Amino acid sequence: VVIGIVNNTVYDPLQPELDSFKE
Amino acid sequence: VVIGIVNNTVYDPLQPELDSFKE
Numbered sequence: 549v550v551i552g553i554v555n556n557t558v559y560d561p562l563q564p565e566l567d568s569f570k571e
Numbered sequence: 572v573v574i575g576i577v578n579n580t581v582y583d584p585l586q587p588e589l590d591s592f593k594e
């Protein structure tokens with residue numbers, strides 16, 4: 549519904565931090 | 572690069588909570 553949106557990736561500070569530790 | 576800064580420790584609400592549970 550928006551005009552002019554572009555693709556990208558938004559970095560999530562929690563995901564790698566809590567995936568490296570939990571393993 | 573700052574004048575007047577002082578030492579201290581900033582408490583992180585996530586670290587102890589996710590370290591006690593994950594163990």
Ligand SMILES: *[C@@H]1O[C@H](CO)[C@@H](O[C@@H]2O[C@H](CO)[C@@H](O)[C@H](O)[C@H]2NC(C)=O)[C@H](O)[C@H]1NC(C)=O
Pocket residue numbers: 555
């Ligand atoms: C990146 O942006 C493009 C267009 O801005 C998207 O391309 C279309 O996306 C829809 C929905 O996913 C598809 O139905 C179309 O077939 C796509 N067209 C083309 C030419 O690719 C695209 O989805 C966006 N994301 C990625 C990962 O490419």
Ligand SMILES: *[C@@H]1O[C@H](CO)[C@@H](O[C@@H]2O[C@H](CO)[C@@H](O)[C@H](O)[C@H]2NC(C)=O)[C@H](O)[C@H]1NC(C)=O
Pocket residue numbers: 578
């Ligand atoms: C606490 O603050 C003091 C000064 O405000 C810091 O002391 C200097 O720190 C630098 C970099 O760590 C060192 O190269 C100097 O040798 C230190 N000087 C002295 C007299 O200690 C100190 O680093 C800060 N942090 C701690 C944990 O003390």
